[PDB]
Symmetry: C2
Subunit: 301 residues, 2 copies
């Protein structure tokens, strides 16, 4: 079978803490002797409309921050602003800190989210960075500070820290350097994202996963040029496919014997004709949140 699968979250659970400033509580990420958390923890509801963060942070001291790992208090001995995050230096180092990196992930790439509340991990699920720089997650009040990550050979690459839920129900946040993905800002306002597009490379990778898992109904005897595929894809609000993306599908193409442009011709037919009551890997719609890597890792190992 084929499933949406997250990375095991244990290496990240051991880093989650609770951060409180006044009456605001959210989650933080404790790596070595630093706690990273959304800066708006220092704000009151009035400040949040137009918070002058540098002006508001200079008014705080180390004792303004209450950090707790479970029921154990960590003393803050330094603080600094890192774009939309705070870096709180604590007097103790986290022995559960995994080997880690901070990465800024690109649209189309996937990551696991560990949703947390009050410093306590609650759930783990997979998301993709949308082309409009939002993520389609599941987050409730108190989820700020929850992180997104990938794991490669025991090294955790942190890529997302949660801040906002837009009026449309999608989510916005920053990388671990504190820079937002997209045109969003940490002000308490209703923000809209730019128009989203479908991640073509991921729809194609998912059709290859279906072939690997014994689903070939959508295939056809036709082919297409790359440009003719891109003309149709753009008409349907799909991202264009580049030669670099065709190259990325090389391994999945050689494994299944299906030429990339032949799979494009199958997708072109699916876009023009629809699925007409049929399913691919259990789904009634074209799925675009599995990368070629997510397919290879799940089908081969």
């Amino acid at each position: 079978g084929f499933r949406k699968m997250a990375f095991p979250s244990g290496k990240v659970e051991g880093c989650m803490v609770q951060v409180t400033c006044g009456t605001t509580t959210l989650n933080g990420l404790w790596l070595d002797d630093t706690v990273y958390c959304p800066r708006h923890v220092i704000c009151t509801a009035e400040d949040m409309l137009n918070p002058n963060y540098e002006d508001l942070l200079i008014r705080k001291s180390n004792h303004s921050f209450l950090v707790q790992a479970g029921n154990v208090q960590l003393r803050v001995i330094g603080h600094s602003m890192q774009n939309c995050l705070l870096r709180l230096k604590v007097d103790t180092s986290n022995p559960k800190t995994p080997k880690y990196k901070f990465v800024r992930i690109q649209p189309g790439q996937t990551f696991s989210v560990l949703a947390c509340y009050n410093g306590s991990p609650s759930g783990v699920y997979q998301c993709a960075m949308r082309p409009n720089h939002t993520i389609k997650g599941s987050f409730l009040n108190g989820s700020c500070g929850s992180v997104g990550f990938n794991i490669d050979y025991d090294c955790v690459s942190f890529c997302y820290m949660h801040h906002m839920e837009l009026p449309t129900g999608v989510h916005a946040g920053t990388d671990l350097e504190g820079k937002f993905y997209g045109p969003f800002v940490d002000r308490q306002t209703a923000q809209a994202a730019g128009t989203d597009t479908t991640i073509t490379l991921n729809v194609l990778a998912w059709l290859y996963a279906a072939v690997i898992n014994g689903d070939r109904w959508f295939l056809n005897r036709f082919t297409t040029t790359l440009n003719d595929f891109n003309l149709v894809a753009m008409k349907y609000n799909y991202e264009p496919l580049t030669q670099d993306h065709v190259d990325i599908l090389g391994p999945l193409s050689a494994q299944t014997g299906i030429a990339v442009l032949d799979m494009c011709a199958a997708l072109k037919e699916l876009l023009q004709n629809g699925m007409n009551g049929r399913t691919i890997l259990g789904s009634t719609i074209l799925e675009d949140e599995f990368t070629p890597f997510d397919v290879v890792r799940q089908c081969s190992g």
Copy 2:
């Protein structure tokens, strides 16, 4: 709504590898016992129809290689319990969470931590189908991976992986080694019974739709549980039990919709068809009344 797994760390800390000869699979280390599928003692020309009692007679404590990473845990006792082995080791796991072993019922959901060579690789949510299979994602070497739920830091283990059926669905046991379904641990093509729709979860999905203001399908009528069950079986839906009605108590009180009044709404959807419910024409059946409350109200 989306499938969300429980944070897997408490279970990752219990995963080990167990090897007999060249056959390696996963094991679960709780206190001083490692639980693993008994077929780890079989060779690649013994699995067709094994006499496990006789096969296990030729094995000793020294036949088992149990490793936490590459660190060996010495085996000091062994016994078989249904389709699992219980290997006593000389070290009590310091990472053992508070835990229970539970035999889940059809319709219930759980998280699966897919493991290979004792190393966790992925985590996803599964529902136990009425035909006693799960629609999981497993490769060679995944045997011994477990399924679980976490409630207030207590891990209730409910599944240990053993098989992939010819249809691609998966079969396994509870943590007492008893298979869910009619399956047996031997290298044979085995068929599951015809599956049905999980009635309890479709009702939970309808309540989740009502909670979100999508309530067109509600009507002014009711039904008895018996009349609903008889109509449900004609549409390949599972009959509801008294436990299923009780499980729906919290969602019924929250929306003010009596369970039998919701069954009357579902009964009309079956007999007359669908228009969308939560943005789709297809009714979702893999979110339990627990999963719905967890995503609508969320832990806090």
